[PDB]
Design an enzyme around this catalytic site. Structure first.
Site, PDB file in Angstrom:
ATOM      1  N   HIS B  10      -8.390  -2.622   9.122  1.00 49.24           N
ATOM      2  CA  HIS B  10      -8.347  -4.570  10.452  1.00 49.24           C
ATOM      3  C   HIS B  10      -6.753  -4.551  10.667  1.00 49.24           C
ATOM      4  O   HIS B  10      -6.012  -4.175  10.217  1.00 49.24           O
ATOM      5  CB  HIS B  10      -8.996  -5.318   9.545  1.00 49.24           C
ATOM      6  CG  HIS B  10     -10.505  -5.110   9.756  1.00 49.24           C
ATOM      7  ND1 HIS B  10     -11.295  -4.745   9.814  1.00 49.24           N
ATOM      8  CD2 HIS B  10     -10.907  -5.262   8.377  1.00 49.24           C
ATOM      9  CE1 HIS B  10     -12.558  -4.751   9.511  1.00 49.24           C
ATOM     10  NE2 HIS B  10     -12.862  -4.973   8.383  1.00 49.24           N
ATOM     11  N   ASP B 284     -11.426  -1.601   3.391  1.00 54.91           N
ATOM     12  CA  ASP B 284     -11.513  -3.250   3.724  1.00 54.91           C
ATOM     13  C   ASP B 284     -10.193  -4.056   4.090  1.00 54.91           C
ATOM     14  O   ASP B 284     -10.079  -4.544   3.789  1.00 54.91           O
ATOM     15  CB  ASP B 284     -12.491  -3.628   3.397  1.00 54.91           C
ATOM     16  CG  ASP B 284     -13.107  -5.066   3.975  1.00 54.91           C
ATOM     17  OD1 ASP B 284     -12.965  -5.214   5.469  1.00 54.91           O
ATOM     18  OD2 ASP B 284     -14.010  -5.514   4.193  1.00 54.91           O
TER      19      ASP B 284
HETATM   20 ZN    ZN Z   1     -14.147  -5.197   6.835  1.00 52.77          ZN
END
Ligand code: ZN
Ligand code: ZN
Ligand code: ZN
Ligand code: ZN
Lengths: 321, 323, 324, 325
Positions: B10, B284
Site C-alpha cells: 500500500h 502488507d
Molecule cells: Zn492491506
C-alpha cells in the site's frame, strides 16, 4: 477406537425444543434431542463412546430475558439431566445449564449442580439476554468476575458454546440466512467472545480456569499467530488490560473439541498450534451423526498415541475421571 | 528467493492518508505510505522482490459516502499511481481504486484504469458507504452485477481487502477496540463478504472471475469443510441462489496471499486445502515490514518448487506477466 | 527455549579418538578433536548460551563395537566409562551418562551395564550398532539368542538403550562402492541402524521384554515415513507375518521406541514424525560435536510445532524417560 | 476421482512368472499368477470400477535385470515388449507401455528402447534396479561410465525412466540374514532403490543430461523424509561435497525426479512428500497386482490434500509428463 469420551452432546426438554424446515428431518432431530437411554446409548455402544458428557441445547437459557424464568428453566433442565444420568452413571456425565442473566443465581446453580448433583462443568451458549433482551451480555464484564472466581474454586471446565448474534448485530448476514448458525455465524460469535475473555485479563486473575471451545476452536488456531503478531514492527505494548499474549491464554487456558469439524487438515493445523494434549473428541450429536464423527476420528491421519489422548485420555484427565 | 512478486503493498495520498497512538511509530508509518520510489524500492532490492503491485490504503474510497467526491478521490489516486508506476514500469504495477458507491462510475473507472492506464486489477476495501453512509453496501447485491460482468470481460483480478465494520455493526467488539482492525475484525468482515459473493451465485453467472484475499484467506481455509459439511446427515439442499458448494467457488475462483500472516502452520493448512497453485506471496507493507515477510517466506517449510510458485510464478501467471 | 535436555552428545578418550578422523575432512580434524576431548569448558559455555540444562554424554563411534578382541573391548569400555563418570562428577548438575558396552562378550556387557547403572549412576547405554568379535568379519546383531539375557537385564535395570549408527563392514557395503560420500551420516548410518532396529522388532524381543525402551537418533533413521508400508505392503494378502514377533512393526515402534532430533533439523521431517509416532516420543538432541549446538538449538526454537510440544520434545519427555 | 492414470502396474509372461513366486504361499499364488497374466479382463474391470482411465503397464521383477546372459536378456526383453505391444493394441485407449530393457548390454538396451519408443510407441522404460551380467555376481549400477551413452539416448528420446526395486544379491544382504521377511517390499526394496537413485545423482548424470526424468515408486523409497540430512549433515563444515556432481542431492531430486504412491497409501507420507518435492511431482500408482487396485484408489480418493492437487497427482501430472495432451 473404543472407550472414547465425547463432550458436546446435546439433549433438550420440551421447553427448549423450539430453540433448535418441516418434514422427516425435523421430526428426527426432535426425537434425537429428547432421547438419551435408547438411540443415543445404542450408538455410543456401536461407535466406541464410553463416556458422554451431556448438555442442554441452544440457545436455551441464554435466550430467556426474564431472569426469573431463566433460573426456573435452568434448574428444571439440570434436574432432568441429573435423573437421566442416574440411569446409566457409568456412561453419562453432565454439564450445568446456567441462568447467567443473573450472576449470583448462576453462581449458586453451578454450585448446586457440582456439589449436589455431581455435574462436571458448565456449558453456556454465548452471551446472555436480560430485561428487554436487546443487549448481548458478555462474560468478560465486571459483574461476572465473582462467578469466574467460583468456577475456578469448584475447578470444573466452562464450555463456551455458540449461539447466533441478535438481529441488530447481524446486518452483515442480511439476505443470507444460510450464513447464520453452524455455517459461519456460530464461529464468529464464539471466537470473539473467547477473545474478549482473554483480552480482559480474566486469565491473569484466574489462571486455573479451563475453557472449552467446540468446532476445533471456532477458527482460532489458524489465525492465532496473526492475532498477536500483526504489525510486528510496531514495538509498543498491546492496549488491552491482559498482561500477556492471546496465544498464551489460548495455549494455557483453552481446550478445543472436534465437534462438527471432521476435517483432518484442520486437526493437523490444530495439533501444530495448540498441541494434541489440548484437543478433545466430540460429535455435536444430535446435530451431527455419531457415526460420521467416530468413523472420521478412527481414520484421521495422526499418531495412534494421539488418537488415544484426543479420543479418551485428555478428557479423562481434564474431568478427573 | 529473488524475483518475487508482492501484491498487497500500500501507499496513500494526502486525501486518504488519514484513513491509516501518537509517537515515532505513527510518524514512520505516514512516511512509508507516502514513499514509493525510495525506501520501498531499496527494501525490494534488498529482499528479493522484483515486482510490486501497488494499491491505495484503506478504507479510503469505500469510506467516502458522497458519490461525486468518491469518484473524484478514486480518480486522483489512480492518476497518481499511474504516474508513479511509469517511473519504474519494470518494478511497479497497479491495482485500481474504485468508487463503488456508484456502480456505473466504478465500472467506467476500472475500464479507464485497465484500458488506458494499464492497471492489472482492482483492490477494494470491503463494503461501500453512500448517502448518509449508514448502510454497508456489499457487492453481491443486484446493482453490482453489471460491474462484475465488466471485471470478467476485462479479465483482471479483484482483490477484496479488509475494512472495519460500521459502529452499529460492531457491538460485539464494544469495550475491545484492540479486536478491531488486523487483530480480528478485518478477517471476519472480509471472510463473510467473500461468502456472500459465493452464496449469491455470482460465480455461476461469471465463472471466470478471479478474487484475491489477503491474510491467508481471512480464516476461510481452516473452516471451509465445516462451512459446507456441517450437519451432513441432513440431506436437504442449501437454499442459497448459488448452484454449488462454497468449497467449489473458493477452490475455483479464489486466490489467497501471505500478507500479514507469516505463519508456517497456516501456510501448510492452506496448501492442503486450496493448494500451492492458489497461494501468493505478499507483505502488507507498510503495515508489515518487508524483511519480516521475506525472511519468513524464504525459510518456511514447503517444497522449493512451491516456494517458486507462491513467491513468483503463480502471480506472473495470474496477471499475465509472461505475455 | 531454556532448560533443554540433549542426549546424543559425544566425547572421546585418547584410545577412541582416531575413530572420528574420517568423519570430517582435514583442517577441521584438529577442531573436531578439540571438541571431542572437551567437556567442562567450551561445551558447557555452548550449553549455557543455547538453553541446554542437561547433556547426557556418550562415547564416540564405532569405538567399542569395532574392537574384535573381547578382553581389549572390555578394557576400553571400562576405561571410557570410568572417565565419563569422573567428568560427570565435576558438573553433576549438568551432565549425565550413557554406558559404553563390550557386547562382543554378552556376559561382560551385562556386568558392565550393571556396574555403570548401580555403581556409577549412569542412566542408560549407547551402542554403535553391531559388534565385531574374533576375526571381526561378521556383524553381530542384538536380536541373536545370546543377547537375550542381556536384554532381560536392561529391562530389569529399566534404563534406555540408545541404538546409535556405525558404518557396515566393507564386504557389506558394495552398494556404496565408488561412492564414499554415501557412507556415514549421508545415508549408510541410517540404513544400518534402521534395519538393526527392525531386526530387534521382528525377533520378538519386545514380546519377551515389553518394558524395554529403545532410542534412535536422526529422527528415527527414516523409519517413520515408511512405517505404514513396512507392515501394510501387500495388504490384500490376509495371512499372518512370517517373523517370530506376535504383533506389527508399528506396534513395537509405537510402544518401545523414542526418536531424537540429532543431526536432522528439518521441520517437515518433525511434522511427519509427530503425525506418526507423536510428540510424546520425540526428543531434542544435537549430535554435537559432529553437528553444531547452535544449529540444533536455533532450529528447534523456531520449528513449526505447538509451544506445549516444544516443551515436551525439548525437555519433559527426556526428564520423564530418564526419571529425572 | 475418475480419469486417473496409474503407472506402476505390472504383468508377466510365462518366462518371468516364477520371479514373483516366493512372494505368496499357496492359493494366493494361484491368484497372483492369474492377476499377472491378465490384462484385458479382471484388470480392466477394476479400472472401470475404480476410476482409472489410463494404465501404463510394465513387466514384473526382477525379470530382465536378473538374466546374466546378454543374449538371453535381449531375447526375453524383446519378447516381453512384443507381448506388451500386442496387449496395448487391443485397447490403446486404456493401456500404454513401459519398455523392459537388457541393460547388461548397454548398446542392446539403447537399441531396444529406440525400437519400443519409435516403433512400438512405448512411453518410457521401467528397470528393476541394477543388472547382473556374465557370472552375475556383481551389481551393475547405471551411474557407471558405460551407461552414459544410453542415458544420452534416453534424454534424446525424451521419455521417463522408472527406477523400480529389486532385492540385493545374497552376498550384499548379510544385514538381512535370518530375516527374510525384511527383504522385498518390507524394506530391502526401498534401500536398494533409494541408494541407486542417490548414485545417479552423485555421479553428475543430471549435470550432463538435465532433461532426464526419473520416476521412483513407493513415495520415493524413503528419500523425502531424509533429504535434508542427506545434504545438510555436519553443516558446520564449510567445505564442498566430494562427489562429482556440481549441485546438491536435493536439487537433482527436486528437478529430475517424480515419485508415485505405489504401495504406500499413507496420508502422513504424502503430506511430507508434498512439503518436500511438491504436489507437481507426485503421481498416483497402485503396484497392482501386488497391491489391490481398490485399496490404492479408495485411499487416494479420500486422502487429505487439496482437490486441485488430487486432480494433478491422480491425472494431470502424468498426462503432462507423458505428453498425453
Ligand atoms: Zn492491506
Ligand atoms: Zn453444539
Ligand atoms: Zn551421534
Ligand atoms: Zn512394482
Amino acid at each position: 477406537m473404543q472407550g472414547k469420551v465425547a463432550l458436546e452432546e446435546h439433549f433438550a426438554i420440551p421447553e427448549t425444543l423450539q430453540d433448535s424446515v418441516p418434514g422427516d428431518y425435523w421430526k428426527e432431530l426432535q426425537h434425537r434431542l429428547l432421547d438419551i437411554q435408547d438411540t443415543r446409548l445404542k450408538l455410543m455402544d456401536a461407535h466406541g463412546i464410553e463416556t458422554m458428557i451431556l448438555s442442554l441445547n441452544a440457545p436455551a437459557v441464554q435466550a430467556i430475558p426474564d431472569r426469573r424464568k431463566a433460573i426456573e428453566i435452568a434448574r428444571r433442565a439440570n434436574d432432568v439431566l441429573a435423573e437421566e444420568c442416574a440411569k446409566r452413571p457409568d456412561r453419562f456425565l453432565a454439564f450445568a445449564a446456567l441462568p447467567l442473566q443473573d450472576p449470583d443465581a448462576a453462581t449458586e446453580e453451578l454450585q448446586r449442580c457440582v456439589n449436589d448433583l455431581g455435574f462436571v462443568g458448565a456449558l453456556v451458549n454465548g452471551f446472555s439476554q436480560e430485561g428487554d433482551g436487546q443487549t448481548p451480555l458478555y462474560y468478560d464484564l465486571p459483574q461476572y468476575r465473582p462467578f469466574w472466581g467460583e468456577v475456578e474454586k469448584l475447578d470444573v471446565p466452562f464450555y463456551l458454546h455458540p449461539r447466533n448474534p441478535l438481529p441488530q448485530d447481524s446486518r452483515i448476514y442480511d439476505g443470507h440466512p444460510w450464513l447464520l448458525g453452524p455455517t459461519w455465524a456460530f464461529a464468529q460469535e464464539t471466537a470473539v467472545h473467547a477473545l474478549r475473555l482473554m483480552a480482559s485479563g480474566l486469565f491473569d486473575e484466574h489462571p486455573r480456569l479451563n475453557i472449552i471451545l467446540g468446532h476445533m476452536g471456532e477458527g482460532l488456531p489458524y489465525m492465532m499467530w496473526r492475532i498477536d503478531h500483526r504489525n510486528a514492527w510496531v514495538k509498543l505494548p498491546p492496549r488491552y488490560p491482559a498482561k500477556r499474549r492471546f496465544m498464551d491464554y489460548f495455549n494455557e487456558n483453552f481446550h478445543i473439541t472436534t465437534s462438527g469439524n471432521f476435517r483432518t487438515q484442520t486437526l493437523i493445523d490444530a495439533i501444530l498450534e495448540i498441541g494434541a494434549d489440548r484437543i478433545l473428541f466430540s460429535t455435536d450429536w444430535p446435530f451431527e451423526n455419531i457415526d460420521h464423527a467416530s468413523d472420521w476420528f478412527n481414520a484421521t491421519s495422526i499418531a495412534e498415541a494421539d488418537r488415544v489422548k484426543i479420543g479418551r485420555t485428555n478428557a479423562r484427565r481434564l474431568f478427573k475421571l
